[PDB]
Design a protein around this ligand. Sequence first.
Ligand SMILES: CNC(=O)c1nnc(NC(=O)C2CC2)cc1Nc1cccc(-c2ncn(C)n2)c1OC
Ligand SMILES: CNC(=O)c1nnc(NC(=O)C2CC2)cc1Nc1cccc(-c2ncn(C)n2)c1OC
Ligand SMILES: [Cl-]
Lengths: 260, 259
Amino acid sequence: SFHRVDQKEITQLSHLGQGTRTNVYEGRLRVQELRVVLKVLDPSHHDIALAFYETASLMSQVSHTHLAFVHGVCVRGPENIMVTEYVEHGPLDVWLRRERGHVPMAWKMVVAQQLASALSYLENKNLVHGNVCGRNILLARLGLAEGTSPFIKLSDPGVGLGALSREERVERIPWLAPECLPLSTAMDKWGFGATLLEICFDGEAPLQSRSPSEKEHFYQRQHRLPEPSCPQLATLTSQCLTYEPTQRPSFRTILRDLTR
Amino acid sequence: SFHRVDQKEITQLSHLGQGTRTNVYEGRLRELRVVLKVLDPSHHDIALAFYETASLMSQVSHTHLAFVHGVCVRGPENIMVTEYVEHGPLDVWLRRERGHVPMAWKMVVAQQLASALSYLENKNLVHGNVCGRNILLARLGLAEGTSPFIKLSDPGVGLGALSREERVERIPWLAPECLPGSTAMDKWGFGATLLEICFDGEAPLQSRSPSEKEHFYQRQHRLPEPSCPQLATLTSQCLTYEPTQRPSFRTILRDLTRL
Ligand SMILES: CNC(=O)c1nnc(NC(=O)C2CC2)cc1Nc1cccc(-c2ncn(C)n2)c1OC
Ligand SMILES: CNC(=O)c1nnc(NC(=O)C2CC2)cc1Nc1cccc(-c2ncn(C)n2)c1OC
Ligand SMILES: [Cl-]
């Protein structure tokens, strides 16, 4: 399970954004104060909150260099608050869009290897992340500067996919595995593939802009996502972004292929 | 001395604040992100003090010194083009994070400020405007294991061109020997900034009137003791009215890595 955090120990600071049924804030935790990130769940039903706890538990009961730490959950009136690791530079997508055209291929390859690494760890433990996207990739060390390499940390997947509505699942296209449109570790290989494209297209994922019906139509008509600009990831993404879950490579394979 | 920048190459954006005879803006250099220090309509002596400042920064290179791209000199306009530092002035941040800034964080800033100032010392160059405002935070060092990373800004219009009223406004950072009409002056600035850091962006006398401030220096009064006794000796050594009695930055840098 997960560690319990009293309301007294946490301080809510500036708003960083909104997740699926959550509001992300900067914050402090008394342990010596630590800079935390608070994911404040919306007033919710028992099934939604349980999906939130299950997510805390996944992140609490694991340990990897490229996985964000979960301090615990605080249960305050209608709100539940996940207390998570504060990462220096925040979401990757935001940064890649800000640094558009000035992000070198080697930088992107390091991020890929690191993301495949953390996802291979969850694979060997037979655990599903269920929300691999650029936003959920946080930059602990920036790596864009002469003589620097990036250091990423994969965020909690938020409210478990199982509790999400169809409308909510559609919003996750192109990262959402098409079999999840109507929970296997096979789903994270599609997420990894779609994120690999988002990284290549400097934080601009294909279909992001398109309408929910346009997005739903793409999956219904079994259409395939664009090819990455860099031909190094071209084979890997095509292998990952297959509609047949069994046809997706293992992260053990992906991790090997990335070293070449 | 200084690189010249054409007016066509620069785009002015959001006003960030005002300096001594300047207005600070966000800007674009043809398309890189910079900070434009737009000098007020000025006399030739004021503009020359501005160029001298550009030259100081232009002809130097240090990890904890802000970069100066050059000066745009067109007709009545004088614009210094400089490095944009992500989180901006330290004083603003320290006041925002008041009570939640740990001592170790402040020591790191101090060591970094003493290092950039030791570099100018070994080159026998005067900054002349060491204050909280002129320390810019490139990295906040908020995450565990992460440390802050500061960059010292240009000192603005050289102190030599400032009026008495303008010099009085720089109390307590201004060296008292600079009030009427040396690298020793930056040791006082460093000392007064070390107090401002300790008092979480609240420097002593900042609230007091110009006459109250002038009176403090005239009557040879000494600035308060820092809350943290680690910097207590260092600040007392730095904030002496005898310029020759101030430690070298070589000494300060040693003392910082021992207390
Ligand atoms: C587990 N740790 C984190 O989640 C986390 N950790 N650190 C930062 N640091 C920072 O931002 C540093 C720059 C100030 C941001 C983080 N999250 C984050 C921030 C903003 C929006 C979202 C969000 N969640 C869902 N959506 C759609 N968007 C979000 O979740 C990933
Ligand atoms: C060389 N580079 C700089 O000086 C500089 N670089 N980056 C920022 N970034 C930002 O602000 C990011 C946070 C939004 C601020 C900077 N200057 C600055 C901003 C506002 C006021 C003054 C100012 N100067 C004199 N006074 C009284 N106040 C000022 O000069 C130091
Ligand atoms: Cl970094």
